[PDB]
Structure 1
Amino acid sequence: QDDPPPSMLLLDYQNVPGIHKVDDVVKRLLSLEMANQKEKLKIKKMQLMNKVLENPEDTSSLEARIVALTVKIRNYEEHMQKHRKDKAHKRFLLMSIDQRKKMLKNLRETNYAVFEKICKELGIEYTFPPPYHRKAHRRWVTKKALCTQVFREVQKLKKQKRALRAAAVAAHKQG
């Protein structure tokens, strides 16, 4: 997890001349210690866009939108741990995840090289949508587990019978 120092000198007063010559009181007032969560969100967004993207000026690009939604998703996840019952924020986070996944699918379809780098840098694992979305009930789960175990036992027994036959024929061909 990123650790922005409390004296980060937020971007609204970071790119101005003569900021390091000011006294500690003004530096602390203009730093992140006296700032709210929005300033830290801006700092994280710029830090991520400077290191993951190649053209920070192009905000309309899919890779820019994905990294813009990434910080919002992380902020929503941070809020969720403190607020378990916040259904509105849970819905916001779940829909932001879906939007990010749709944009990732579009980026994978359009430019694969950028998609791979974005996924590798952001740690996002893109999974293909599973066909036939179904609610796995108890009967189906039990029957599927039974079928898998039966198939494994049948193949194990057939492999053992094959080994026994191979040993018998090897013993018989010698004498």
Structure 2
Amino acid sequence: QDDPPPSMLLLDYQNVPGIHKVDDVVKRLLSLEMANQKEKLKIKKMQLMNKVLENPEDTSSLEARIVALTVKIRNYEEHMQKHRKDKAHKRFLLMSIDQRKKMLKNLRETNYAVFEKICKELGIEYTFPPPYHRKAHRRWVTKKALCTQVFREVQKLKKQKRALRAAAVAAHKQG
């Protein structure tokens, strides 16, 4: 997560010369104080790419787009935490995650070195798509739990059989 400082000139009114010589009044009118959420995203996107990307001037690169989507994904999550019953934005959040997931897979199969750096910097955790998407109903999860528990119990029966029964035979040898 990132936190743009409040008293910073917005993206556009930065490179123009002669700003620091202006009085505090105009600097206040251009800072993030008098700018809406839209201007905040620009500063987040500008800073984020300058920290992880190699060539910021390239926008068509996959890594650049993944950074752009991550900014929107974080923005949607903040909106979702406030407006919980909103369904239009929840759909956007899920589709944005799926698009980033699809683009991360494409980046991995082309440039592994860049994919590793993007995955580490942004904190994204890439999980392989599990085969055979099935709905885990109560009957299946119950029976699966029993089979795993029975499997562990069989190991204990054999493990103690390996210890005690062999020792009993070895008792005759040792005497």
- TM-score for both structures, normalised by structure 1: 0.98
Q: CA deviation at 1:170?
A: 3.0
Q: CA deviation at 1:125?
A: 0.2
**1:76 matched residue in structure 2:** 76
Structure 2 counterparts to residues 8-27 of structure 1, below 5 A = 8-27=8-27
State percent identity of aligned pairs: 100
Q: CA deviation at 1:114?
A: 0.3
Q: Distance in 2 between matches of 1:18 and 1:75?
A: 33
Q: CA deviation at 1:157?
A: 1.3
Q: Distance in 2 between matches of 1:172 and 1:59?
A: 79
- TM-score for both structures, normalised by structure 2: 0.98
Q: Distance in 2 between matches of 1:154 and 1:45?
A: 56
Q: CA deviation at 1:34?
A: 0.6
Q: CA deviation at 1:16?
A: 0.9
Q: Distance in 2 between matches of 1:152 and 1:72?
A: 46
Q: Distance in 2 between matches of 1:64 and 1:149?
A: 48
Q: CA deviation at 1:28?
A: 0.9
Q: CA deviation at 1:3?
A: 1.6
- Alignment size in residue pairs: 175
Gaps of 5+ in 1: none
Q: Distance in 2 between matches of 1:119 and 1:172?
A: 61
Q: Residue 43 in 1 paired to residue 43 in 2?
A: yes
Gaps of 5+ in 2: none
Residue 14 of structure 1 aligns to a residue whose secondary structure is coil
Q: Distance in 1 between matches of 2:94 and 2:165?
A: 57
Deviates more, 1:152-161 or 1:46-55: 152-161
Spell out, residue by residue over 1:17-43, the C-alpha distance to the aligned partner (whole angstroms, 9 max, x if none). Answer: 111111111001100011100111010
Q: CA deviation at 1:172?
A: 2.2
- Aligned-residue Cα RMSD (Å) equals 0.8
Q: CA deviation at 1:169?
A: 3.1
Spell out, residue by residue over 1:43-76, the C-alpha distance to the aligned partner (whole angstroms, 9 max, x if none). Answer: 0001100001000011100000000000000000
